[PDB]
Amino acid sequence: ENIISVDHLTYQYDENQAPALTDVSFTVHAGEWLAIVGHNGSGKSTLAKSLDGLLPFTQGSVTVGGITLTPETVWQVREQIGMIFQNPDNQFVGATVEDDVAFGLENRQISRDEMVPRVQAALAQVGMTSFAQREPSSLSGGQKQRVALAGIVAIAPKILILDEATSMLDPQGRIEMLAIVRQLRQQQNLTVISITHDIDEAASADRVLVIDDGRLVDEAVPSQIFERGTQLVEMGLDLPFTEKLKAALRQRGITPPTTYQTAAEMEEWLWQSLS
Amino acid sequence: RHKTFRLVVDALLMAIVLLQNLVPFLGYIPFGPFSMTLIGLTVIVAGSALGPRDGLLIGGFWGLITFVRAFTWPSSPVAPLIFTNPLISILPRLLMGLVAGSLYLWGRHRQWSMRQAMQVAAGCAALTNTVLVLGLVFLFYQTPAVLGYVLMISLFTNGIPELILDVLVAPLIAMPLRRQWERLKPQ
């Protein structure tokens, strides 16, 4: 649960530069996976930034699981919000994996006695325990992100915000990070918010929020968004394959179902169609 | 927030300098008995991109390294003579990140352009760096308390590696900084 109502953030001038936002409002339930797709310069970038203390908006108010975001209520909202950013280094503190995972705690007053076993536990939760002694340089974008996640699991909050956390990741690396969030969701009832252009990440969500030129412009379950077909790419998300296939069929004379099909559904339809 | 950001930027100018020491291609550029540094022109930046507070820190971090370098892993062969007394090595670096910072502040207050202030604050911070080494060398040329010709020779082989470092920073030093304070200024 968290609540955004009537939010605006410009640079105080016009609509361009760092993506503006005008009158954005929605609420997340508890233990929901909300994805927020959008093109570029839809404020979906800064909208992530805003649900933490890190963005000084003039209009609108954010409230996260009770507390509403104010200069002196920031550290008590951030406490229950774990954010993972686009770039895998640049959020890496300390030489060694285990110093980073601990960085959350160590500079949050926890004592090395309670801290040591919560860290080996956190590292093991993401399947990273052997890499504890490791320099970040010797790690891939994939891994570097899994320890960012181990960092948030070590402090254990209720909201995980994934600001295009898979953006800069190799597909095999990206696949792992996603599966270990799904893996995470099953246990502890974690609440996930994702900003992505990834179809897989966006399809694993319960509900999708489409931003367009700084304004929240649609909202649906994922099966509804995917019926946007090729207009999806322009919208801020790649194409599910079945929509690739349906497109390539229209081009060749064949008129397929409108409602989004899955591989399983589409494969079945073709067989039934083709006798 | 801003203070935290500053803490990291220092720490990264602090890494660039470690990096220039570790990689000799970045630290300097030979002459060939002599060699003009580039570790100098990084502090001119830290001074006049953030302000003198940081030009102090990065300039100090340098002079502290050329200190331990002089014993453990010498820079020049003319380093185990000079930069082993931490006044002579430290003072020029520390006090040239200072001239760096303020002489941009000062010259902006004089309503100069961002180019003209940068340039001036560099050819100065070079100067008010080289002079101190000649200064501090001339001083410890003449006293023991624990080789005048040798001291003179040491002085001679600074009045040249640095004479280039002065023509270095004034054009080149300005370019990697005008962009920098620009991004900083908006923040």
Partner: protein, 236 residues
């Protein structure tokens, strides 16, 4: 047995301030005994250390020639009356060798972040003088981890620059420095933009102040051996 934490620095700090004192020969015979005594324990190869030392001795000699050369020449074409250089150059070379040996013995038995946490805990005093030593620890701990990252990104910019048509190394001194702009400008800007992205991340993490640091962070007998062998040395 490199498993020595902090003192190792204070050791070599204090090992340095010993080498100057030793004027006698019956004295600093004691030095080589504990100098090679240190090296012998760490490894028996005795080759890499000598090999890994050669590059430096070209310097120490390059200096020592200067000491000797000037006195005989007198900067005057005075030839070789150069006794002072012989004793004074000899002392130098001797001194700036026992140090290098032991500093190089240090660097080869101590991972660099173990120093940084040592150095920034040999100033575990040093508070109560207005120095925010713990914050400087932070910026140190950070500086360290970016050194490899900056180094990768540096050669990366460089090769990319080369593809464009930039000649690194070619010429001098002007054309050689002028080729350094297309690598310098981005290196810094990337580091700036790097640090902006980094600080933001730290804020998201629950850190708001440098003052509270937790986590991370046998030895005497070495200082016993550097006491019952040190004070038992300034006798001579």
């Amino acid at each position: 047995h490199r498993l020595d934490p902090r003192a190792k620095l204070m050791l070599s700090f204090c090992y340095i301030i010993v080498v100057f004192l030793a004027n006698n020969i019956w004295s600093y015979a004691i030095l080589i005994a504990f100098t090679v005594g240190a090296i012998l324990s760490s490894k028996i190869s005795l080759g890499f250390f000598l090999k890994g030392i050669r590059p430096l001795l070209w310097l120490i000699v390059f200096t020592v020639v200067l000491q000797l050369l000037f006195s005989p020449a007198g900067g005057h074409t005075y030839f070789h009356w150069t006794q002072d250089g012989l004793i004074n150059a000899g002392y130098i070379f001797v001194r700036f060798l026992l140090i290098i040996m032991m500093s190089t013995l240090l660097t080869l038995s101590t991972q660099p972040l173990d120093i940084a946490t040592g150095l920034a805990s040999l100033m575990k005093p040093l508070r109560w003088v207005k120095v925010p030593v713990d914050t400087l620890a932070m910026m140190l701990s950070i500086a360290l981890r970016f050194v490899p990252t900056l180094m990768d990104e540096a050669t990366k910019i460089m090769n990319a620059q080369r593809a464009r048509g930039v000649d690194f190394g070619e010429g001098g001194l002007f054309k050689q420095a002028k080729s350094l702009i297309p690598l310098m400008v981005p290196l810094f800007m990337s580091a700036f933009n790097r640090a902006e992205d980094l600080s933001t991340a730290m804020e998201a993490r629950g850190y708001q102040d440098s003052e509270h640091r937790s986590q991370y962070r046998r030895d005497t007998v070495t200082w016993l051996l550097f006491l019952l062998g040190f004070v038992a040395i300034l006798i001579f």
